[PDB]
Amino acid sequence: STGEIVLTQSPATLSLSPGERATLSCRASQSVSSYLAWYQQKPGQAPRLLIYDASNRATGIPARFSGSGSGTDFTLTISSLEPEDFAVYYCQQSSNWPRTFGQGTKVEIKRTVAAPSVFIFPPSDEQLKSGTASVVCLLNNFYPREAKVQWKVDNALQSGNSQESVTEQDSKDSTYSLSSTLTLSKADYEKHKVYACEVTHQGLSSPVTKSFNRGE
Amino acid sequence: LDSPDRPWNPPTFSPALLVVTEGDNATFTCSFSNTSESFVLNWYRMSPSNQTDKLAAFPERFRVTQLPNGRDFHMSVVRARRNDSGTYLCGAISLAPKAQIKESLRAEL
Amino acid sequence: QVQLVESGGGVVQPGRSLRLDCKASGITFSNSGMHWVRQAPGKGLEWVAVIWYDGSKRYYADSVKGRFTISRDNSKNTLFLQMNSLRAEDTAVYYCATNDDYWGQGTLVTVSSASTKGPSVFPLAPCSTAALGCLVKDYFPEPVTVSWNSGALTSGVHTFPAVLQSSGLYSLSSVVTVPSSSLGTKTYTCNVDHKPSNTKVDKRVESK
Ligand SMILES: *[C@@H]1O[C@H](CO[C@@H]2O[C@@H](C)[C@@H](O)[C@@H](O)[C@@H]2O)[C@@H](O[C@@H]2O[C@H](CO)[C@@H](O)[C@H](O)[C@H]2NC(C)=O)[C@H](O)[C@H]1NC(C)=O
Numbered sequence: 172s173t174g175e176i177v178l179t180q181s182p183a184t185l186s187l188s189p190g191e192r193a194t195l196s197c198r199a200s201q202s203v204s205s206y207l208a209w210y211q212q213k214p215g216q217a218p219r220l221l222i223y224d225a226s227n228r229a230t231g232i233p234a235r236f237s238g239s240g241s242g243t244d245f246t247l248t249i250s251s252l253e254p255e256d257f258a259v260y261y262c263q264q265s266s267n268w269p270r271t272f273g274q275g276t277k278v279e280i281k282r283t284v285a286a287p288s289v290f291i292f293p294p295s296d297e298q299l300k301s302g303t304a305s306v307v308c309l310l311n312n313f314y315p316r317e318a319k320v321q322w323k324v325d326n327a328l329q330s331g332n333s334q335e336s337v338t339e340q341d342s343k344d345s346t347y348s349l350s351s352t353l354t355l356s357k358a359d360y361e362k363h364k365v366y367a368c369e370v371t372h373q374g375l376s377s378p379v380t381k382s383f384n385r386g387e
Numbered sequence: 388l389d390s391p392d393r394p395w396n397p398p399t400f401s402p403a404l405l406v407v408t409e410g411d412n413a414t415f416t417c418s419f420s421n422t423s424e425s426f427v428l429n430w431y432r433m434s435p436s437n438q439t440d441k442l443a444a445f446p447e448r449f450r451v452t453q454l455p456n457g458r459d460f461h462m463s464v465v466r467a468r469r470n471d472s473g474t475y476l477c478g479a480i481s482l483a484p485k486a487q488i489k490e491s492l493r494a495e496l
Numbered sequence: 497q498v499q500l501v502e503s504g505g506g507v508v509q510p511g512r513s514l515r516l517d518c519k520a521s522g523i524t525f526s527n528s529g530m531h532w533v534r535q536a537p538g539k540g541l542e543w544v545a546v547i548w549y550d551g552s553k554r555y556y557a558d559s560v561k562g563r564f565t566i567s568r569d570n571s572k573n574t575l576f577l578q579m580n581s582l583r584a585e586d587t588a589v590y591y592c593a594t595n596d597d598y599w600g601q602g603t604l605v606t607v608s609s610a611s612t613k614g615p616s617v618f619p620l621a622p623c624s625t626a627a628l629g630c631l632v633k634d635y636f637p638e639p640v641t642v643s644w645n646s647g648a649l650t651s652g653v654h655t656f657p658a659v660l661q662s663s664g665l666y667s668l669s670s671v672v673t674v675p676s677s678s679l680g681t682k683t684y685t686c687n688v689d690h691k692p693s694n695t696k697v698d699k700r701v702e703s704k
Binding site: 175217261269274275292305307336337349350354 | 558
Binding site for chain 3: 388390391392393395422423424425481483484485487
């Protein structure tokens with residue numbers, strides 16, 4: 172009897188300059204009438220209501236934010252993007268229980284393409300006195316966000332033993348940075364010589380590899 | 388309900404038609420039974436084509452004063468011109484993000 | 497001057513229970529329907545539950561129905577979330593919010609068997625410009641904070657979001673890029689703070 176109303180937001184990411192017009196879409200899996208709200212969330216902060224019931228601005232929300240639609244198709248419009256407006260936006264239906272959010276659209280600063288600067292770091296001697304080796308590969312200050320990192324150990328492609336992490340868009344140059352950490356036990360670390368990080372990115376005309384030999 | 392919030396009653400605007408001759412003061416009573424302390428009260432005027440004009444507001448020719456009873460307010464035009472004939476009403480607006488507005492029934496001047 | 501404050505967050509082992517409080521001030525609490533909303537690290541918003549201003553109705557998301565129970569005490573301005581049979585995937589920031597959209601600032605609930613532990617801070621030694629940093633490894637729970645030179649070094653700093661390791665411990669890197677020519681003249685130290693364990697580490701990072 173009860174259904175889950177799925178809210179699909181698009182695009183996942185809108186890349187735009189300050190002052191441009193932003194248009195965000197939300198489509199509901201079944202009619203929601205006008206019970207559709209839009210929220211803004213900045214990192215480390217609670218969400219904040221912008222638009223409720225499809226088209227009303229919340230108290231104190233500036234006039235550049237407007238909403239429209241009904242039934243299953245809804246639009247949030249930011250007429251001229253302010254630098255405060257680059258953030259994640261969620262839609263939420265209040266037509267039925269359970270209440271549901273969309274998965275969110277990120278509004279990011281659009282920017283010229285920039286290749287990463289790649290650095291590799293062997294494990295510290297201090298860490299190796301413990302039982303473990305972490306090898307860290309840093310991709311600094313690139314755009315767009317999509318970057319591929321592959322670890323090679325004596326040219327063997329690795330799988331399952333690295334975890335990566337990406338920063339939020341930099342407020343000064345609008346780039347992203349990424350760190351990939353490969354962990355092995357000391358015993359397996361000492362079974363091999365050449366530790367390589369191979370990076371693929373739109374700004375690199377061919378993959379770039381940073382390497383070291385254990386021992387120097 | 389459909390709403391998980393407590394319903395509230397719209398303000399009442401009286402008298403349903405006030406008749407005063409020129410140069411004098413005319414005064415309506417907006418009676419709003421609040422449940423929160425977080426609202427504002429607006430005094431509106433409807434043109435013949437139902438377009439709205441915000442005359443005054445509490446908190447701040449057209450005056451709005453808040454009675455000590457906690458409930459009532461008095462909306463008073465001073466020295467009434469006859470291009471003032473027509474339609475005036477009051478409405479309460481909540482201050483929460485999801486603002487709600489309830490309007491009074493309609494009176495004639 | 498309207499304020500929603502969640503309390504009761506923290507660490508809880510899987511299968512066990514935890515109760516959240518939300519204290520409201522600046523509103524007539526008993527007029528407001530109340531919600532819980534949660535957000536798992538790096539994920540989207542997830543509605544949890546609602547209770548009528550009345551308590552006359554309660555609804556729940558599929559993922560928590562029966563394990564969680566929402567309630568309220570309209571004579572003490574507080575909203576409760578009783579959470580039972582907690583699992584790792586219940587780890588999240590939990591927000592309370594009114595139906596008219598006032599939001600609390602959230603409290604972190606971590607569901608894990610791990611016990612509190614400070615980080616080991618390892619150097620990322622520098623090898624034009626140079627990169628260097630600190631590996632902030634094997635701590636629990638979130639969060640840590642990192643600064644450089646007691647806050648005097650901010651330009652060029654990237655402190656990465658933590659990752660949850662398959663061991664149950666968190667790990668995080670912080671890096672900065674500097675002029676290669678500064679490597680022999682400037683000192684660079686990590687300032688790593690992990691409140692749950694009262695850990696305050698300063699790690700000097702230098703060329704090897
Ligand atoms: C109903 O409202 C009255 C009046 O108050 C509001 O005060 C601010 C919120 C303002 O911005 C406007 O919304 C209204 O004027 C409340 O009575 C007041 O109580 C306080 C308590 O100390 C007192 O200082 C004021 O003088 C009172 N004013 C009047 C006109 O009586 C009243 O408490 C509200 N009722 C309920 C149930 O909340």
